[model samples]
Target: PKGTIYLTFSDGPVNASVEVIKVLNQGGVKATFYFNAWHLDGIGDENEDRALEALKLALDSGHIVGNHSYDHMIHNCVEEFGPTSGADCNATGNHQIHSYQDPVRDAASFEQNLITLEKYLPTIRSYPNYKGYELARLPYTNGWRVTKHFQADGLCATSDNLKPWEPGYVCDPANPSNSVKASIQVQNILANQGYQTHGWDVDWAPENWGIPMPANSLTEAVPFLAYVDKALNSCSPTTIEPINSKTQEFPCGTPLHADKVIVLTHDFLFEDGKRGMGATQNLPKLAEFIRIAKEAGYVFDTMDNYTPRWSVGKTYQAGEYVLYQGVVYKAVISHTAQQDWAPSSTSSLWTNADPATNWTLNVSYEQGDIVNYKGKRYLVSVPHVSQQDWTPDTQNTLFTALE
Candidate 1:
């Protein structure tokens, strides 16, 4: 079985975006970038006017660009809700928040994002690569609304209320607050406007959510890749628990979602020297992950045609693979597919499988534990769990040459 991975970066057009692009170029792989338009106005977290530059780079390099929103819900929430509400918006219990507190305004932010982008790239619509700004991702939330038949909300992706992984947080779709309810409405409205909003299947995240980027919290690229293996294989937590109740227990691969895994992460993860604690370390991690993933047989592509080109009326059997719209999916169940029911990520018709490489940092080592990294074999000298930094060749105290 062959699986597809959509690498998506959010909250950017910032300084780190340049580095991210370099990594993508080095990997010879393209990715979908969801960007906030704040930097286009010469205002943003890094207070840099490089948003358009980054956007242009992505577009020219054959990558996909999606509207993340203008001002990233920073101004709208404050303007419509008042100063107090504006302060409340960012006060997500130590988690920085983004998103207009109102549904109408939140959805409007989507269009506004495009408008800002258009202002920068005046002939944006002319570019054949231009996506017409149809693809989008909600700020500060993991929610999806692709179509009437395919839609979902992140049950625990909220910021202030229904906060994820924290005590006292609740995620009752049936019982949502004004903010959650508004976010849901935004999803629907965007869908109605022929927009496709996507949520993440897995996150290349800092250990602590809601914290600033380069926060010394990223999951090392190797183990993170293992997490990806679990995701494509349908063994991840969100996939198992079902990130969205509407999508619960819907089987491993569902249309559009089948065999395809969308990754959520921030561009700021690669900033070389933003805060006082300077230096770029995570850039190579991402690059290394991409290189490793390619070695593992993962295909990277933009989101406009997220689905692979699956031929209708083709007889697909279990463990068989098919290419749909340029992406690939492996059938999990035997069936003669029809025109309407083409192979997709949400169809449960197929699953994706990629041959994983031998190198993995998740493995625990015993005195005799032997491992391979970068094509070299090393035996464990100390019995312990493997850490990304503690390499076999580098840390002689922990590992010895197999030869």
Candidate 2:
């Protein structure tokens, strides 16, 4: 089978996003958009208020919208003063001077990003196809926090201290620093809050990344597809190298990461007049890429469900979970999950400790229905379908404490 490809776009919701969405829509394919909330408030680069409109369009069009932090943690200043100095440090007169060097401040930025998102997307839970708002991607880094048990930090990821083209932009794989120790902390913090972050396996970036308005170097659709094929079967430059043989698994999955590959790019890359190429140049490339990828037997999907879903030929050990039809199931046997052999209570392949205790968004609940919300038990006080906003808590009218 052709490896799954996840098309993920970050730092976006700009004017160019309209064209990006058009390209995806024309191909009848969906992608993930990791948007920064700073653009909503006119704080960072490309602070056009229309950015919010583009965001709403993406959310409404069935695209997965993941958070990219409120501000890209551009807190480091060139002066001797700390993150609080608020000094204008960039020679290019840029608002975003540097990235957060401290760990604590970096992690807190994620918490604040969510708060900002809620203001614009007040009824985020009401959307028909809304995935939980607990998905994110860090700006200016190729880091990942897929789940509590499965997490990895990229040693070769770039730091925000320098521009995309600066001399010391990318971190050296051999001699890496904990400069973004707070980035690790941020990952843990989001995981604790039920968020699952994802990083790209391959980035569709510009050849000239140092200056503004970088053009898409992967302009040819066929070569781009070949690049994806090679990354899945073999190794890619961005593949996180194994630090420890026993503790850390290489490629990071049952099939050695051959099962899936994520493609990353920016929305601004296709905007007209931004780069030297006209807007028409890159839009066709995106459409053709999607068409070629699908014609070649690859499935295009979003990154919302970070965990691999149950599929034929997939090797699964006992105690791993796979998502099927909006519900998660635990494997009862060490076997490959297939169509007919789905995980269920009576099926020898799976077991559910208590179906009532498990909260399922598709399941309807009557009054007094017992359920679990983020490990906390609650009794349904009112009839309602499961929704992300209806989490069990001390003060919610829909649920009461079981204890």
Candidate 3:
């Protein structure tokens, strides 16, 4: 594939999600869903009445499910600063600020979302596509805390007084609003807890928000496909069209940000209700977009695969890992990785750190890797480079016996 696209839908587990999943399944592609678990309890809007079933369907169909925070931060907003309640806080026109008043409490929303999800789908964590709480997207903010070198935030996502679309609404990066500052802290909190928060590079939405049904505020599939090509060439989020101040910006050539596009859309937009007949009108477009994207040499992938794939002309440092053919290989030495220096058993610059049939000496092993030692399977309890003296059975601190 010349380029990769990660189709990520947010604020889902709504009834519309079922149809969205069907489109993805029929297209032989997968997507990532950042869901607000409140819908699972039917506490959300009418469209989310069957959210639990939609959640189960997503995992069953091999689609990745990630946290979008519980109640889309409405609970936090109500608890910290309240005048509005329920759906009012989530209204499109509401521009609610200070949603993340306390970074610790805000970050904990991710865990709350997972707990609620597990209550309905008890074994969801066991599913291959269930990302648990490792991956997340903020409720109404475009932010990134992916890696040390790749981080950015929607500096003016919220405001203290002025609405984003209102004139004279300026959010200087040097002096961000209180809401944006708190949101930035929330990203740090999540990253400290080992979560990789991702934002989108391009949005698949209607050109105008005030348009009515049949028009349904959605771009046609063929034109949407062309928009993706333009985004790729421009190295968006650098060149992404601003949605108020919710657009994210980072250097174009950042390691993981380059050659990849994350398309953001809301599952609720695909429903047939007050919003319009989106299911009847947009479902076919979703399928068509997948078909045309594949035809254009682009591969659709889930967000977990956002880890940069091993490629030529990239510099790698020791301990850095890259995905190659779905296997994670660690860089053994700092070098400029090239086409001929691909990750393999024979590559001196890289080590096949992925779990193998048997433990081998001088190989880097990450935590949670399973290996067979002396006909017994064991799990790596600690990450370390293998040494002959530190055999699986002998090193209690490094390996735990499975049986």
Candidate 4:
């Protein structure tokens, strides 16, 4: 209850998304829209102008445009689950990964989603405000960073740690505890990439089968303003804490001890009237919730400015850096594993050991010695920083690969 609110939307670029974004823009509130290029195709990419228009709308209006992965499917990733699902991300056919028997074949189906989505939004890279650059929230779930070696030459890297809870994707089949482990990996990946992954504090839509949406006796749909209020103000007591201290618990799914609420809303909620994404519907109400929340004296923000260090969190750099308190370090590197580094650009080192199979590559940077930042000896989990801007206390060179 005692914090700022972050309003974010996902699975959007839908017809309703336009309206939602319009309202958000008019209200002087900056929002984050995690999108999927496949969405336009699945729904209708034939409407090129509309798609670009929507994307441009978000960017032009000063909003944070992020990636919901490309396909937003769970087909190929279902290998860990034996049931064989049409709900997989790697399926082929129109979307075959879900209907395939061979996982190898399905891998293409999975990778294609990214390619397909990229094809759909070819100009995505051009968007200065787009965070889809390297940050992705897998379909219908948490923004899972599958690999951390986000470089040009090397393989992917991830940590063995895991998160306690996540908003969705609790049913991840790839890794049994993927929901937990992946979340931790996501944090590490983002931290390593000088990025951050965001989850919602509020669920605007009704629960579906994965959780439970009351079938016949559904509850009345809430308006957008109501949804916003619930998300922004519905802070759990556990989230509160003194400034600059670690609390290790996030009841609202925001940042740990975040004084702000990040509300998560799906686009389909407003578009479908009832018995839809939530087994029930009332989008009009969702709209009003946004308007009312604004009138009620609440400030809105985009994820772009919520840098963890500004509050309480560890800094993330590519190659490696000290995980110190009071500051969230960030950086990026250019291509070249055995060469001098160039911070703030996409760089990588090549290795046969894939992060998924072999994690020893995690310490490649530390082979010589731990890299230092601001006088701290940080274990370069995935070192990237090479060159430095020699300055003083006032001149801080933040190594950031921003969204």
Candidate 5:
């Protein structure tokens, strides 16, 4: 593949999503859907009544389904985390910043989305393409938490006082608004919980939200091909023209990001009712975009495959594993992989997997080894041949409890 494209749709499982999935299937490509599960219960705006069928169609077609949070953060807009829906929150002009009041509860919404999805499709977990809370995208923010080095927040995603397009609106990246700050905390909480959040490199949307007709959209199939080329060449998150879409900041050409582009669109944008014959105009455009992109040697993949084989200049977390020289080695510390730090016996950053069992005396332990000791799990912090006197509970320097 000359370059890779991860086509992701957000805030969906709406009636229009069924058409979107059909177009994708007919195009012979797969996409990732970051869905808000509220629609599955028939609780969303018009055209969302078929949310369950849309989700089923997506899964049956082998497309990846990921969490976009429940209710699209509508609960954050009201006092006491009120029972507000996505439409209700949108009715309020001040729907932007301060959306994540309690980061813990806000992060829990991702889990809530999964629970709702499972309720509708009990066998969703058994689906091969069900990302199942592992991959996520924040509602209305383009934030990334893929790895230690590939993390960023959309500091100007929302405003506390002024609208983004207002004349006096100014977003100071150095001193973000209260809502953006809260959103940053939410991203951190999700990262700690082992969720890989992704942001887009390009946005496929109309130039103006109010007039989202196909003619007024950003680009068509021909220009969209050039747009992908420019995005790969620029390697900047700001390559996406929309302010909120400018979330990721990882330098281009880095591991897992190089030669790849993630294009973001909303399923609602393809609805035919009030949004102006979008289903008629945009669906065919989408199919043409896929055909042209493929002709240009672009391959489509899901977000879960965003991370490929380990290579230099990649940031890895402590628990991530890499296959090196036919052996799987786990990272002991979060760091950027370097040429000199290739996983091996001499490297302190990784450890080869050993038989997982209870800690024993006189056993050689390497860094990152996990052993059960006294009904508790501990990770070896330092490489040493253990002794009975230096049990995991006795030496703080040698072991760290999993709890």
Candidate 6:
């Protein structure tokens, strides 16, 4: 198929994750989930049950369950988590059990994430007919590679974090701070993991975020389809499916990034659940979007089927760009650009090496722009750094989507 759709979801395994799984099953649509261990907390060891249930739901329902970080709300919790207020570990009080400022404590938070998730689901592997290793997604902070290779082999091992899913209370990922982290992480550590972090394209989301979550957020489905087409043709966005609204950026071209499409979405959106669990705004209408999207040539796929058969993106040199489907985009080295993290001000993260010379090419290019790298005619998006970045952890050969 020319276009592949990997409907990946993040921030779940909660009350809503269950329903989402159900809806996916009904649609016979298998997607991937980048779950967090934090959702399994209150659940007794082995996950009081809901967490376990959530994982089983994905596994049993033909979907794949990947890591989204043990705690989806990492990096952002310091700002006074749901119902607490105090100096967690430092002058800044980042929500760590001890002094937030203490590097050891911050590091412990990372370790705790592993401990928490393992309590629920145990093994890490592809689900329901998948032929690949299990995958992962990070929480409030991507750049997971930062904690990926701790000298201790078991330190951040996905093998260790696997367990039954847990259950419990959590907050909204729709929040801006969380949204920003979710989006930017793509350009962060995920690149190294070669994991595609998925986000919703047309959420029948509720009216929130000042921008109005829109009962008809479903309308975005049209453009969302177009984005997929763009991704497949040349690699405008990057990934088996690449459209992340959280960071509100179109990496289009950065080094380490390949020209591909990776569309993201949660099964729960169709279920009547607020924030991945609860009651949906409208199911029938949401179903309409799914039907139309699939009818429009979007083949629902699990992450396993969508790897970069194209050139290993990071293999490219400094001044190169590629496009996947029809969309035009580029990759630049990771440098510091003003990125938004929701309710918070626009913070800056490395946007490759030089934001100044960042690849700025037209998304729509001509035949000459399409490079015949190998035997493929890849449309040129822009120059970028999909994998390499200032962040020590993100340097890798293939900065891909959720594996």
Best by TM-score: 5
The true-versus-predicted C-alpha distance at residue 133 of model 4, in Å, is 1.4
Number of clashes found in candidate 2: 2
Given candidate 1, what's the lDDT at residue 44?
A: 61
Off by over 4 Å in 6: 43-49, 74-76, 79-114, 122-134, 140-208, 211-260, 266-282, 308-403
Over the stretch 1-403, how does candidate 3's per-residue lDDT look in tens digits?
8789999998888898998999999999999999988887766655777788898889989999888887777765554433344456656445356666667777787888889988988998788678866688887678887653457887777666677667977767667778778888788767655577888878888677766673376898899988888777465665565643344466567655666788998887787888787888788889999999999999999987887679899898886868675444678789997777788655667765432336765566778877778878789999987767989989989999997
Candidate 1: list runs displaced more than 4 Å: 76-100, 159-167, 208-214, 235-252, 274-279, 309-403
lDDT of 2 by residue, 1-403 (tens): 5778889988776778887887898898888888777767665555256787877788788998877776665554444434333223333433322344666666667767767767877876676445535577766555665422345665434344553344655545455445445455666556545566666667775656455555745457888888788777554523433221011222345332456887888887886654646366678888889989999999888875546566777888976766554334566679976768875434667543212245644334678767666668788888755555566774379888766
Superior candidate under TM-score, 1 versus 2: 2
TM-score of each: 0.68, 0.69, 0.77, 0.51, 0.78, 0.47
Which digits, one per residue and each the tens of the lDDT, describe model 1 over residues 1-403?
3578889888878766876897899889888888877677665646356677888887888888887877667764343433344235455333323343667767787888888888889977766556635678876666665432245565444544444554875656556545556677777667556566777778776665455544466777899888888888572424533233123323334555767777887787676554312226677778888878878888877777674446777787675655554334567678998978875435657542211113334333568755666667787788764556877768889878765
Model 3 regions lying over 4 Å from their true place: 76-84, 90-92, 243-249, 308-403
Q: What is the lDDT of candidate 5?
A: 0.77
The candidate maximizing lDDT is 5
TM-score of 6: 0.47
Q: In candidate 6, residue 134 scores what lDDT?
A: 29
C-alpha local distance difference test of each model: 0.64, 0.63, 0.76, 0.42, 0.77, 0.39
Rank ordering of all candidates by TM-score, starting from the highest: 5, 3, 2, 1, 4, 6
- State how far residue 265 of model 3 sits from its true place (Å): 0.6
Tell how far residue 89 is off in model 5, in angstroms: 2.2
Worst 10 residues of 5 by lDDT: 353-362
Q: Output the lDDT of residue 214, model 3.
A: 34
Task: Give the per-residue Cα lDDT of candidate 2 at 334.
Answer: 93
